[PDB]
Amino acid sequence: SEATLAPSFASLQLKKLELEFAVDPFFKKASADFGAKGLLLNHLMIDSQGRIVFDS
């Protein structure tokens, strides 16, 4: 069983996961809502500070 087993579990380890990506939900909604009626400023929403929110 010596050579069939691996030692320490570090030989079967890993530390970098394939954590696909983050894509923003505002982007996903803007894709669905936008041509000339989804002008991308009709589409957007205002903010409490007083800006246009595309980045979450």
Side-chain angles (χ1 to χ4, degrees), residues 2-15 17-33 35-36 38 40-53:
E2 286 118 306
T4 61
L5 290 157
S8 66
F9 177 79
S11 50
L12 322 154
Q13 180 73 272
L14 70 70
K15 187 62 101 83
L17 301 313
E18 281 286 292
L19 293 176
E20 170 199 67
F21 49 78
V23 54
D24 195 295
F26 286 83
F27 192 96
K28 298 294 284 177
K29 179 61 87 175
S31 304
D33 292 340
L40 197 87
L41 262 163
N42 182 59
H43 182 62
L44 263 290
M45 205 96 127
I46 333 320
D47 197 49
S48 299
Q49 310 160 342
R51 43 163 276 262
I52 308 153
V53 190

